[PDB]
Amino acid sequence: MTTNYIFVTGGVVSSLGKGIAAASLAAILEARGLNVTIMKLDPYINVDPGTMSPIQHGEVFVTEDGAETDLDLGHYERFIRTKMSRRNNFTTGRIYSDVLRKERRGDYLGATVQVIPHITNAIKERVLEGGEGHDVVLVEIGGTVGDIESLPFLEAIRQMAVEIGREHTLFMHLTLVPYMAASGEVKTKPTQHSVKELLSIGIQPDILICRSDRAVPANERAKIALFCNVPEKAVISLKDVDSIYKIPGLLKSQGLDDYICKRFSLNCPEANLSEWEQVIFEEANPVSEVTIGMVGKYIELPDAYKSVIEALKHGGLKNRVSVNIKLIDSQDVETRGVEILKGLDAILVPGGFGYRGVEGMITTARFARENNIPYLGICLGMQVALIDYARHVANMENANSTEFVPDCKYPVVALITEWRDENGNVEVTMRLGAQQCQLVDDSLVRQLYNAPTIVERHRHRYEVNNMLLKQIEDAGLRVAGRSGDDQLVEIIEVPNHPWFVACQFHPEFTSTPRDGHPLFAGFVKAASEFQKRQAK
Amino acid sequence: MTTNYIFVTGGVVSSLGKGIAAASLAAILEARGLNVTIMKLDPYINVDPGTMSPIQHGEVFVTEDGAETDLDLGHYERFIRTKMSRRNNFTTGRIYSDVLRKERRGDYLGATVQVIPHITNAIKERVLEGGEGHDVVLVEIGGTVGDIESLPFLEAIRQMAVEIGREHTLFMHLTLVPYMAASGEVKTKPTQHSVKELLSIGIQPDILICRSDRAVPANERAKIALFCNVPEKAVISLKDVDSIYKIPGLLKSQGLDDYICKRFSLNCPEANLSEWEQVIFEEANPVSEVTIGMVGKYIELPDAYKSVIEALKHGGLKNRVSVNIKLIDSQDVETRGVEILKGLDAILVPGGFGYRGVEGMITTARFARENNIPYLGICLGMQVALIDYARHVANMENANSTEFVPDCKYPVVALITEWRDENGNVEVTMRLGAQQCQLVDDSLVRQLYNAPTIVERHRHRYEVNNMLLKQIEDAGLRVAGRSGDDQLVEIIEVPNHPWFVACQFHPEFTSTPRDGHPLFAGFVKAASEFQKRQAK
Amino acid sequence: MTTNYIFVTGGVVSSLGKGIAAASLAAILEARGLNVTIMKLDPYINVDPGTMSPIQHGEVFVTEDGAETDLDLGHYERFIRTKMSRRNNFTTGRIYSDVLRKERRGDYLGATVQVIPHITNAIKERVLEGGEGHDVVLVEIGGTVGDIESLPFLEAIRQMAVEIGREHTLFMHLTLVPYMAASGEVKTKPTQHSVKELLSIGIQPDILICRSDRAVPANERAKIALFCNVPEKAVISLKDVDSIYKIPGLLKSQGLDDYICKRFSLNCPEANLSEWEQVIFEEANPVSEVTIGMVGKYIELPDAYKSVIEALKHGGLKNRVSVNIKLIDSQDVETRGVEILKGLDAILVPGGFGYRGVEGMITTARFARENNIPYLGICLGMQVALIDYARHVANMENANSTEFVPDCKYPVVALITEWRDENGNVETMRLGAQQCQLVDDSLVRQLYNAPTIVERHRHRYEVNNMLLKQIEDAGLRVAGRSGDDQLVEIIEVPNHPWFVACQFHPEFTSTPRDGHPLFAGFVKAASEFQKRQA
Numbered sequence A, B: 001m002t003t004n005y006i007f008v009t010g011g012v013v014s015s016l017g018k019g020i021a022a023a024s025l026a027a028i029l030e031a032r033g034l035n036v037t038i039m040k041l042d043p044y045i046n047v048d049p050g051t052m053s054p055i056q057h058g059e060v061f062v063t064e065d066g067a068e069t070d071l072d073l074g075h076y077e078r079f080i081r082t083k084m085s086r087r088n089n090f091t092t093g094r095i096y097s098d099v100l101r102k103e104r105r106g107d108y109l110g111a112t113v114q115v116i117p118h119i120t121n122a123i124k125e126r127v128l129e130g131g132e133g134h135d136v137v138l139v140e141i142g143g144t145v146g147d148i149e150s151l152p153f154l155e156a157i158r159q160m161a162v163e164i165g166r167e168h169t170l171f172m173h174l175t176l177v178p179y180m181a182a183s184g185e186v187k188t189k190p191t192q193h194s195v196k197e198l199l200s201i202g203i204q205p206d207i208l209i210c211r212s213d214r215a216v217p218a219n220e221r222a223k224i225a226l227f228c229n230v231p232e233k234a235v236i237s238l239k240d241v242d243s244i245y246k247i248p249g250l251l252k253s254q255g256l257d258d259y260i261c262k263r264f265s266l267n268c269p270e271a272n273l274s275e276w277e278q279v280i281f282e283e284a285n286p287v288s289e290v291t292i293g294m295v296g297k298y299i300e301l302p303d304a305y306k307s308v309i310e311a312l313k314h315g316g317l318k319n320r321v322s323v324n325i326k327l328i329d330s331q332d333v334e335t336r337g338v339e340i341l342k343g344l345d346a347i348l349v350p351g352g353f354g355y356r357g358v359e360g361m362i363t364t365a366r367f368a369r370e371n372n373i374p375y376l377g378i379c380l381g382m383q384v385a386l387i388d389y390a391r392h393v394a395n396m397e398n399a400n401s402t403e404f405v406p407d408c409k410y411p412v413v414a415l416i417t418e419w420r421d422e423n424g425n426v427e428v429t430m431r432l433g434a435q436q437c438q439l440v441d442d443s444l445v446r447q448l449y450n451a452p453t454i455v456e457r458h459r460h461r462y463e464v465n466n467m468l469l470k471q472i473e474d475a476g477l478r479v480a481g482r483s484g485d486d487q488l489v490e491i492i493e494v495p496n497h498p499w500f501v502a503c504q505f506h507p508e509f510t511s512t513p514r515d516g517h518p519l520f521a522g523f524v525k526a527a528s529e530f531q532k533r534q535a536k
Numbered sequence C: 001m002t003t004n005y006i007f008v009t010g011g012v013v014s015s016l017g018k019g020i021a022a023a024s025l026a027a028i029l030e031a032r033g034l035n036v037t038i039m040k041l042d043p044y045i046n047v048d049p050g051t052m053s054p055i056q057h058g059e060v061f062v063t064e065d066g067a068e069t070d071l072d073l074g075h076y077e078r079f080i081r082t083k084m085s086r087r088n089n090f091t092t093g094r095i096y097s098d099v100l101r102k103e104r105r106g107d108y109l110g111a112t113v114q115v116i117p118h119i120t121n122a123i124k125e126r127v128l129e130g131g132e133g134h135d136v137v138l139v140e141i142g143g144t145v146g147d148i149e150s151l152p153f154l155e156a157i158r159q160m161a162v163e164i165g166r167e168h169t170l171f172m173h174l175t176l177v178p179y180m181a182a183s184g185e186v187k188t189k190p191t192q193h194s195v196k197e198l199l200s201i202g203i204q205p206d207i208l209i210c211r212s213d214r215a216v217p218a219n220e221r222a223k224i225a226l227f228c229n230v231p232e233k234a235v236i237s238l239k240d241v242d243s244i245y246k247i248p249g250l251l252k253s254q255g256l257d258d259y260i261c262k263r264f265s266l267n268c269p270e271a272n273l274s275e276w277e278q279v280i281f282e283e284a285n286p287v288s289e290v291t292i293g294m295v296g297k298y299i300e301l302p303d304a305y306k307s308v309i310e311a312l313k314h315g316g317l318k319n320r321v322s323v324n325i326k327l328i329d330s331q332d333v334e335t336r337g338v339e340i341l342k343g344l345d346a347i348l349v350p351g352g353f354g355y356r357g358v359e360g361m362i363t364t365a366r367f368a369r370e371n372n373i374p375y376l377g378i379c380l381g382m383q384v385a386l387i388d389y390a391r392h393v394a395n396m397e398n399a400n401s402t403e404f405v406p407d408c409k410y411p412v413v414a415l416i417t418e419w420r421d422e423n424g425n426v427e428t429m430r431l432g433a434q435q436c437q438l439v440d441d442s443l444v445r446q447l448y449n450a451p452t453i454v455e456r457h458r459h460r461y462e463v464n465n466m467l468l469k470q471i472e473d474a475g476l477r478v479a480g481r482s483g484d485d486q487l488v489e490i491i492e493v494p495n496h497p498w499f500v501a502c503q504f505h506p507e508f509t510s511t512p513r514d515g516h517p518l519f520a521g522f523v524k525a526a527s528e529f530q531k532r533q534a
């Protein structure tokens, strides 16, 4: 079978939704029984996102294979069943760095290494690699057409198009079609100027995804179609919707899939799209609603928690519950006190790094624990709990994590190597990607997950100090999950609490609108119950 | 004192002479008593030229400080007395690689590292660094305006201009002004289109260096001046000349220096320009002429030997001899035989790497030696000699260099570590940049250089096997120079030969038109003598 | 039969030779029995080219239908047998003028007239109007790609190509590939940037015509081919040649025609460049050489006299003679004297307008007639002759043309209305092709070998029929007449070696391939004289 590529670009502005539009398209092609995939090309120099601050570009998606990537990969996984790999994401940095080493060790044989073709070639290699055995590959070019940081990417793809030929390649360009309140009309001009931009680099768009407040009247669509030398049909309107789960539907509604299948000469049986409809439906027909407090540190940038939010959302879906997420900065907790934790049906403590707020978190766990509030802790969210418990239950006085106080008497949380006693006795690092995990019989999670073992994704160094374990266990805490090896503790639960769970891995990276996720589903049902009973 | 920058760019085509034009300008500013320097920015990805094949971009200039750089740095040194340092040359590669490590180790604090400003900033840093304590810095931007590989450089400099302000910055742009044989006229159009290119990136040229076959009539100059929004005076004609030594003169002739001093508000006393005139004069008034054979391997690309050629040229100057360089590929030597070495007044064997031709070279040395032909060998040129001698004089049968035959009985040439015997006995790497060297009493060179010690530049690994030395010495060869430490052999001479010298370092990197060079001068006088006596 | 279009564009610099390139390309397609045509679009405001001076843009070509056009049309006509009409040449000025006009008479219905589409449409209209009934049309866009001057033209064609489809549209782009002495290499960069310029405007060239002083190495070519996404076969090398007449050959030699034929799905029998071959052959093998003197005004712009020059060049092909053309300023005749006419095997006085050096010309005319030197005078050149004769022979003191001296007394030359005698007794501008009646015993009748002929005019001032009989009497021959008012078209001097002068511009009908009676004969004479004189 011949592979096909859909190059996705955006113009006018960034924050256009190129990531989502591609996933949506993928979803709709998935639905037509096609072997599909997506890949994101990042113009930034960071070798990988492993370095970026969540507040810069958002959260660090972690793939099964332990790669740290752009959040768009999440979008990818929540729209198509294909699993993302290191292969699905790459930055200029990565590109350059490879080329540099190659060169540095002489793979170019004293040749002058240039942007064209050396660099372009490298880009192309990676794209094909990502394509590798798929009917359709969606290649998201990050950035805005017309800036310079993406020139190579573009040149690269332009080349590919020429080589592969247009029978297996398409140019899908997202553009902004602003609404002029005064004139009372939408403007194509921007689209015009942008398209000219593409042309000017040898690229002629095949399809135009017109973003805007509202729909893009046939009138203007025609206008566009005409000046872009694009078939009217190829001009799609992509207005702002109240739920991205609808996006797939609009595309289809406009026979994008078709257009796509025809251009590529593929056999695409008619689809149902029932799964998306169902999601939408569940979404719109809630029974109860609740408020969930998400207490963290990077809350200034919600995208810093993309996946988690979504996961909560899916939770609601699976339970016909409407979730209202109250974003809470730990600072303010230690600052203004628990008072703020008033009015919550459940609480979530996500991962992070710092100490910046840790305290607040802890306090919070404590609060949720003491006040029997359904609580869910992830990564940092788990430690904070261990801590709260050890401190105020095991009476480990000033329990902590070597990450924040390398010399605590009780380093309940610490790297393996650091592992010591309250005395000082010893024993005779970065966990990334998918990891098997054995669930404990008689544990909530064993129930929820409904299986002895599961697989979740990791992104952390600090572990639960096995040395101080038995002690805490003895205090009451319960180990619900472990990881083979040094049987490292992965999940813990508070025994006789309505719903109190905490884990190392990032369940969120595994949840989806379509199939939800056990923990969140449970977390969610729990929160409802709470609210219901808070007046039962 | 405030530093000033002259940004040099070229348009239309490459091979415009931007390197030379800058040196020429520098020379003329030097001459007006200004503290000046030049720097070259290379758009290529190679971290440094240390990797490039001479045939790709030409020879690898080596600075005092042992850096491997663009040949333009040579041009630089042959026009101004300032010495070049690693600081005077840099590539995108170097730029990127620095940024990558910085980032890789987190100097950006989880920030998204971008082209703008991260990369630009890095470029700027380096430029200032190069500027550091100089009245005037000429910054040569490599490549052609309008390609993408130099966008960052340009953006970078544009920024600098804005920051520094136009009281301390200028844009000098070289352009092509083609001659239309049919129309019988020169065309500015190209210049027009190029300038538009600059503008389009925020840059407005301050001066225009118009290249062409002939001079650029005032008519067109005016035309240009007018549409480029450039003072007529700022429009210079830079025709093709029979000797680059004249270039400086034209610039001056057009009061470029002045223009420059005024724009920068500098105190520039009137100059003489006598040194350049003198050079030109010597050049034009030769007494004898000779033919010098340059037998090597990379001869397909003359630029592969820039410096050497020049050095020979300077030799001629200092001796009022006209040198005719017969370029000779070793291959053809071993192939067609010595026959070809017929009709030479002297012979030069430059450096290189391979084995590709080595044999030929050797044969050649032999030839020159046997036939009493003034011979000069550099780097590879030296080994080849050692070899010839050891083989055909010391009777070391198949003497060689571990670089070409790691298991010879007699590895006369070898890395220190490799050093062994003809038996196999032992003893109980890259030399770069300026190195002191002690001359041997009673040696030609001691005479020529007129000093006990000198300083030459190195670029090699393989050394003369001290183990097999005494043997060869005994055979007749003479060590004329050594390098302290392992008193490594640097120069050798054949005792009772008209003029037979060979050395490790690259004298060429130290010669100039203005002050010539001893060895070459001698080499040269010798060749004359030969020719004169070949009919005396 | 679906009309096909070849858009001819040029980059890097102006003066690339698009006109010729296009003409040569047509020549070939014609040679494949193709119904071809060519048109030229000028980014200029001058409505009519008939206004601009020759020192400006060269000669004003005149078509059959009387249109005053850009010289390129001359090229066209000398490469293809198709005939040009006004519909084959247009300026921006014409377009706007039409639109404006068409606008003012409410044709637009209070609509806003815009560059796009209004202007662009206007253009497309003309383009099609001009490609009416041809399988192949060659549209040459004037100006350099990248200049604002021609965007509308460029946009118009882009549109067409689109509407029409690639199965009948091609983009042939002329480019400059300079040679760098130092480097010793030809440069493709400019081409690169040039193509970018095109792409920037929505056009992607189909063929590349590489202009250079030397041929373009495959190596470089291949490069280009790549970066421009054109088949190597589509990248033509078109070096500087010693004679444009080889162009066709070059082109075919490279298979361009085949490319076109295939691209257009046209049946094209193998080409026949026999005639082009002949021309080249003749050109290269002269058996004799002469030096012909062209005495006129605007000689500071050879292009001002294009068609004439060629015609000469062509008379030589026919006679296998090498023509040495000596450009001479009539003024210098007035000034320096008849000395300059010293050493010429024949004299040619071209037309023109303005009193400037008319007198120098008269002297020249005399000289030739008096010294028995073959003479050919066109338009002004004819008058000058009449004048000469009238005076120097008919003793018509200070004879002249009311174009320079209205109180003549002897206005042997003047508008028809103006006709009047010496005593004072009595009783617009001609353009295009017109029948001419040849006088029976006239030499000109002989050369032409026919009672009537057709030639093109571009003038106002006419032979004063009033003073005719007089001069006619002094012994002057009236070789050709118009029609009705039997106006004098040609006059021959009695028993001079070869003395001919005419009103119309024969040069507009000469051709390398078919030559021209007058010129041929003229040149023939030049020789005989040259010969005799020795």
Ligand SMILES: Nc1ccn([C@@H]2O[C@H](COP(=O)(O)OP(=O)(O)OP(=O)(O)O)[C@@H](O)[C@H]2O)c(=O)n1
Pocket (backbone or CB within 6 Å): A186, A187, A188, A189, A190, A223, C114, C115, C116, C117
């Ligand atoms: N490359 C182009 C394209 C169009 N136009 C001009 O664009 C004008 C129409 O644009 P405008 O009225 O501003 O609106 P639209 O192009 O329809 O776009 P919109 O309403 O979406 O802003 C026309 O007169 C046309 O001459 C132009 O000058 N250059």
Ligand SMILES: Nc1ccn([C@@H]2O[C@H](COP(=O)(O)OP(=O)(O)OP(=O)(O)O)[C@@H](O)[C@H]2O)c(=O)n1
Pocket (backbone or CB within 6 Å): B186, B187, B188, B189, B190, B223, C013, C014, C144, C146, C147, C148, C149, C150
């Ligand atoms: N940005 C520009 C600049 C100039 N022109 C047009 O350029 C023409 C003149 O150019 P040309 O005759 O080709 O030669 P020059 O510009 O003088 O340049 P050169 O002779 O060096 O090629 C003018 O009609 C002017 O309208 C244009 O269309 N767009």
Ligand SMILES: Nc1ccn([C@@H]2O[C@H](COP(=O)(O)OP(=O)(O)OP(=O)(O)O)[C@@H](O)[C@H]2O)c(=O)n1
Pocket (backbone or CB within 6 Å): A114, A115, A116, A117, B013, B014, B043, B143, B144, B146, B147, B148, B149, B150, C186, C187, C188, C189, C190
């Ligand atoms: N649009 C482009 C095309 C190429 N390059 C760069 O172009 C350089 C090569 O150009 P150069 O050596 O100057 O000559 P060519 O383009 O090969 O052609 P010519 O020598 O005929 O001018 C490479 O570094 C490549 O990265 C660029 O920056 N932008």
Ligand SMILES: Nc1ncnc2c1ncn2[C@@H]1O[C@H](COP(=O)(O)OP(=O)(O)O)[C@@H](O)[C@H]1O
Pocket (backbone or CB within 6 Å): A010, A014, A015, A016, A017, A018, A019, A020, A021, A072, A238, A239, A240, A241, A242, A244, A247
């Ligand atoms: N059609 C839409 N309606 C509403 N919100 C949208 C739509 N498309 C995208 N979004 C939102 O806009 C932002 C851009 O999404 P993304 O696809 O990641 O943009 P980018 O183009 O930068 O990749 C996200 O916050 C996403 O939730």
Ligand SMILES: Nc1ncnc2c1ncn2[C@@H]1O[C@H](COP(=O)(O)OP(=O)(O)O)[C@@H](O)[C@H]1O
Pocket (backbone or CB within 6 Å): B010, B014, B015, B016, B017, B018, B019, B020, B021, B072, B238, B239, B240, B241, B242, B244, B247, C182, C183
């Ligand atoms: N004015 C000139 N006359 C003759 N040769 C020149 C002139 N300027 C430059 N050259 C030659 O042209 C080439 C370009 O020189 P250089 O300055 O290195 O070009 P670039 O613009 O690529 O840096 C060299 O071979 C040099 O010898």
Ligand SMILES: Nc1ncnc2c1ncn2[C@@H]1O[C@H](COP(=O)(O)OP(=O)(O)O)[C@@H](O)[C@H]1O
Pocket (backbone or CB within 6 Å): B182, B183, C010, C014, C015, C016, C017, C018, C019, C020, C021, C072, C238, C239, C240, C241, C242, C244
């Ligand atoms: N291959 C060629 N060799 C020599 N002269 C040429 C060639 N092609 C064109 N020319 C000449 O160059 C000039 C350019 O004229 P023209 O063809 O009108 O160029 P343009 O129309 O592109 O301005 C003319 O004098 C023409 O005769």
Ligand SMILES: [Mg+2]
Pocket (backbone or CB within 6 Å): A017, A018, A019, A020, A072, A140, A142
């Ligand atoms: Mg995205």
Ligand SMILES: [Mg+2]
Pocket (backbone or CB within 6 Å): B017, B018, B019, B020, B072, B140, B142
């Ligand atoms: Mg340079």
Ligand SMILES: [Mg+2]
Pocket (backbone or CB within 6 Å): C017, C018, C019, C020, C072, C140
């Ligand atoms: Mg033309």
